[PDB]
Structure 1
Amino acid sequence: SSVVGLHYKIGKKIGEGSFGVIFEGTNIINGVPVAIKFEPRKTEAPQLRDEYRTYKHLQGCDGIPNAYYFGQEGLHNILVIDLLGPSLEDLFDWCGRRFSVKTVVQVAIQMLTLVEEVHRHDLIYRDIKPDNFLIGRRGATDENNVHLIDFGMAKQYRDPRTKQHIPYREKKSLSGTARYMSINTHLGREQSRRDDLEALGHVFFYFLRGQLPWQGLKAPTNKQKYEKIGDKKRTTPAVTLCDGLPQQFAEYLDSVRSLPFDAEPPYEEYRMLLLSVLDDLGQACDGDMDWMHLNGGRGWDATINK
């Protein structure tokens, strides 16, 4: 049968989660579209049952989609959530692999707020990348707002009732994407709130410069490539990465790298630091983003851009 979760018809396949069986769906009750997620049963890495419970925990938070169904169906686990638009990596490629200063700033402030809400619910993300940040759908009220999805790497960091941080430890397996992970993750240290914020700092320079200096290194094995990548991050100060860029981006990365392990980041102060970039350059924060000027003003297309 084509109907799963009682009320959800399976449509076309959308991927972008390894080859995880993701689809576009349609609630046969009201017609709203969804994003159906399958997971093979009796697999070596079961994580769908817990990703559901993370969406219910963050249910009601802005930028986090709602979870609507989870149950057994044949030899698969199915999770129905909201359907969202392209990723920041998708819009990045379509704008020439370079974002202007105003759009990097405006997106940065929304990404900081989404990460803070995750931290207020006793969770850290541990997989910061623009591929997991999506806008909304065309014609919707949240069409160009930034959303956060995929919490298969999210990790509890403090007790929900005592608010006591997890103890510091080392000698852990490398977890995340090598291009954006913090220096502390390269060293096999326990991740905390400060590492999500440093990963966000690497994404900002990735948008401004179009590339990062630790891209395209040669190494015979995989382990030696992550070492060589983390080495370039300790040799490059924040000032050189900020060459020809507003120095507040260098101040941000340096500050989040000086945070203690169990310290609480000054989120509002970081967002005010990134806002003053627009004041120094005579710009307003009205919400105008670069991808809003694609294709003569129509916006992003299907067959021309994808």
Structure 2
Amino acid sequence: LRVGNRYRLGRKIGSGGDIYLGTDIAAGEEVAIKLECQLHIESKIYKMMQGGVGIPTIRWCGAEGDYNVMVMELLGPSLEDLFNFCSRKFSLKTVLLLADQMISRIEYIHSKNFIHRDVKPDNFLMGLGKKGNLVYIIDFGLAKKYRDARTHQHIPYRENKNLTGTARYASINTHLGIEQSRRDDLESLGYVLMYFNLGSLPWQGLKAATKRQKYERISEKKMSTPIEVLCKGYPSEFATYLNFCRSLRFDDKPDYSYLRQLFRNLFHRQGFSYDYVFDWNML
């Protein structure tokens, strides 16, 4: 069960390669271990992202027996696990506390010349203990460089591309086959926030013969659902957010500060406090 002299491999607990529990024997601390029979590609991204708020720390990376191994600090449940535990209903306060942090995580990945390309509830995990108020972002398996690290030359505009994320949260431009850029991670976040508000999305649970037929039905439903209808009965900020994302040009640097201020002004109008008391903390 030995991993890089100081780690002990525990039980399999999920998938992202498979995810196992483990122990840093020397420090007396539980860890998360990702085993691969892409791990190296992804480890380089995590390494570049190190030091960022809500970026998980990679303790060790190497190879053991038949596997490539990555050791990460242990984090808490995903927003999808917490949403299901909360009966698929989050108060407006929880959605807004989450939106503030999620915009910041996305901005940080973009500042490091990458786009995530798979913004969904399963890829945001709450921290544990003293970091329990922190939203972490994970899984750089589908991530891609959008600009040169030195020159900041944006990748060219490309058409006729495959869907490289989850269909439910994909941007309209992703359904059209356009190369993903910064605007696309933010538009996906906009659908995640509306999903937390509604408990479901209108293009969710569409029946079809093939998965490619289902994506074409999701595309059609998204393109025929006005933002004002999708967001009806919820504060206007959710619609304003999605409209701003949809207006972004391919190589535009999004105004992240404006997007955070949109939700922060609504948060203050509602009289909420930034005490990081989420719905699940009340249970």
TM-score, structure 1 normalization: 0.90
Letter in 1 for 2:231: C
1:7, distance to aligned residue in structure 2 (A): 1.1
SS at match of 1:179: helix
Structure 1 match to 2:111: 120
Matches within 5 A, 1:77-92: 77-92=68-83
- For 1:209 and 1:22, the matched residues in 2 are separated by 30
Letter in 2 for 1:241: L
1:71, distance to aligned residue in structure 2 (A): 1.7
5+ unaligned residues in a row in structure 1: which ranges? 41-46, 295-306
Range with greater deviation from structure 2 (68-77 or 204-213): 68-77
- For 1:66 and 1:141, the matched residues in 2 are separated by 15
Cα distance per residue 1:176-195 (max 9 Å; x no partner): 11111111111111000000
Task: Find out whether 1:39 has 2:36 as its counterpart.
Answer: yes
- For 1:52 and 1:155, the matched residues in 2 are separated by 13
Matches within 5 A, 1:1-306: 2-17=1-16, 20-40=17-37, 47-137=38-128, 140-294=129-283
5+ unaligned residues in a row in structure 2: which ranges? none
- For 1:225 and 1:12, the matched residues in 2 are separated by 35
SS at match of 2:69: strand
Range with greater deviation from structure 2 (121-130 or 73-82): 73-82
Letter in 1 for 2:33: I
Structure with bigger helix share is 2
Structure 2 match to 1:298: none
- For 1:79 and 1:33, the matched residues in 2 are separated by 14
Cα distance per residue 1:188-221 (max 9 Å; x no partner): 1100000000000000000001110001112111
- For 1:94 and 1:32, the matched residues in 2 are separated by 26
SS at match of 2:59: strand
1:16, distance to aligned residue in structure 2 (A): 3.4
- For 1:228 and 1:130, the matched residues in 2 are separated by 22
| Superposed CA RMSD | 1.0
* Percent of aligned pairs sharing the same letter: 55
- For 2:265 and 2:230, the matched residues in 1 are separated by 19
- For 1:101 and 1:173, the matched residues in 2 are separated by 34
1:83, distance to aligned residue in structure 2 (A): 1.0
- For 1:5 and 1:67, the matched residues in 2 are separated by 13
Range with greater deviation from structure 2 (78-87 or 63-72): 63-72
Runs of 4+ in 1 over 2 A off after TM superposition: 279-286
SS at match of 1:141: helix
Letter in 2 for 1:38: L
Cα distance per residue 1:262-294 (max 9 Å; x no partner): 000000100000112123323222222100011
- For 1:278 and 1:21, the matched residues in 2 are separated by 38
TM-score, structure 2 normalization: 0.98
- For 1:31 and 1:86, the matched residues in 2 are separated by 21
1:73, distance to aligned residue in structure 2 (A): 1.7
SS at match of 1:14: strand
- The aligned length equals 283
- For 1:82 and 1:94, the matched residues in 2 are separated by 23
Letter in 2 for 1:76: Y
